[PDB]
Amino acid sequence: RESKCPTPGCDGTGHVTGLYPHHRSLSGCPHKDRVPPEILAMHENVLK
Numbered sequence: 520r521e522s523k524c525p526t527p528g529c530d531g532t533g534h535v536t537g538l539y540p541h542h543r544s545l546s547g548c549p550h551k552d553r554v555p556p557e558i559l560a561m562h563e564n565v566l567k
């Protein structure tokens with residue numbers, strides 16, 4: 520549910536290892552960079 524990860528920066532494609540049909544909500548997210556196009560967001564954490 521919910522939300523996802525798609526933040527203003529993140530794209531939501533390429534899960535944590537790009538081995539998934541995207542992530543749409545953090546569970547994956549292969550970026551991890553805090554800011555931009557990554558996972559910024561997630562919630563809590565950013566960046567990580």
Ligand SMILES: [Zn+2]
Pocket residue numbers: 524525526529530531542545548549550557558
């Ligand atoms: Zn993401």
